[PDB]
Structures are given as structure tokens and as C-alpha cells.
């Protein structure tokens, strides 16, 4: 678990501890407490249907930036366990979902 706090109506960046050893194809999962998780961003660039535009993916530029989930306009329901399902050509098969950065929102009415 990785704790993080952000203010209301602000923009947040969500990263994971794993590094992109080579070309990466990350999947982003948002697991609400009790509620079932939902895939937010996959393929580093695409967002499945039925998802708000508050999250933008991090494209692949052959190097550099890691999986940075850009939460534009964080809401109250964003307090959940965010998962960085990272896949690359070096670590082989990612049989684990890694450590989940539990983001919580403070300063709410």
C-alpha cells in the first residue's frame, strides 16, 4: 500500500514503483473498497468505454516517462486502491499486480 493525498478539484499523477525495463504496455485498475475494480487505462494510450476523461494515459516514447496516470479533476469517488499492471519485454510475464497506491482524497465537505 502506498498512501497519497490530494485536494478537491485538483489534478493528480498516479505512478507505480516498477520501472519500464524496455517497451512497456501498462494496465491501470481502480479498485474501490467493496466495489469491483475497473480497468481505466490500457496499452499506455487507450481508455476503454464508459470511463470519464479525467484520466489520460502516458504514451510510449521508447524510454523515459513511467506509467503516470494523470487524474484531471479528482472527485470524491477516486478514493480507492489504484493498481499499476505493468508489462514489458524484460520482466516477461507479469504474474503480479504489484503494490497498489491507495490514493485518498482529503479536504472534502
Amino acid at each position: 500500500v502506498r498512501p497519497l493525498s490530494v485536494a478537491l478539484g485538483e489534478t493528480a499523477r498516479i505512478s507505480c514503483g516498477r520501472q519500464a525495463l524496455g517497451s512497456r504496455a501498462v494496465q491501470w485498475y481502480q479498485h474501490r473498497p467493496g466495489q469491483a475494480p475497473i480497468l481505466l487505462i490500457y496499452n499506455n494510450q487507450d481508455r476503454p468505454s464508459g470511463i470519464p476523461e479525467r484520466f489520460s494515459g502516458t504514451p510510449d516514447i521508447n524510454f523515459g516517462t513511467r506509467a503516470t496516470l494523470t487524474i484531471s479533476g479528482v472527485e470524491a469517488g477516486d478514493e480507492a486502491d489504484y493498481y499499476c499492471h505493468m508489462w514489458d519485454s524484460r520482466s516477461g510475464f507479469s504474474w503480479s499486480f504489484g503494490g497498489a497506491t491507495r490514493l485518498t482524497v482529503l479536504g472534502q465537505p
Binding site: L21, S89, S91, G92
Partner: protein
């Protein structure tokens, strides 16, 4: 070309102390590789 090749290597570096017993392991990869990349670690004589 042959004689001109050797005269370009004689002032270069010699690697006679290079090949010691190399503990070579396969590079960080998954299945269906072929090898072709040996991560070798070895003792090397430093300046001293």
C-alpha cells in the same frame, strides 16, 4: 589491405588479461530467446 590492417591494431589495446573464467548467465529475458546475449561477470586486474 592486410598489412595496413595490422598497422592499425598494433598501437591499440591488448586484451591478453581479459579472458578469465567468465561466470556467464543468460540476460534478463523471457522464454523463446534463440542465448545470443551472455551476461558475463569476471575478475579483472585493475590499475593497481
Amino acid at each position: 589491405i592486410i598489412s595496413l590492417w595490422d598497422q592499425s591494431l598494433k598501437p591499440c589495446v591488448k586484451l591478453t588479461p581479459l579472458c578469465v573464467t567468465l561466470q556467464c548467465t543468460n540476460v534478463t529475458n523471457n522464454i523463446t530467446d534463440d542465448g545470443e546475449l551472455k551476461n558475463c561477470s569476471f575478475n579483472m586486474t585493475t590499475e593497481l
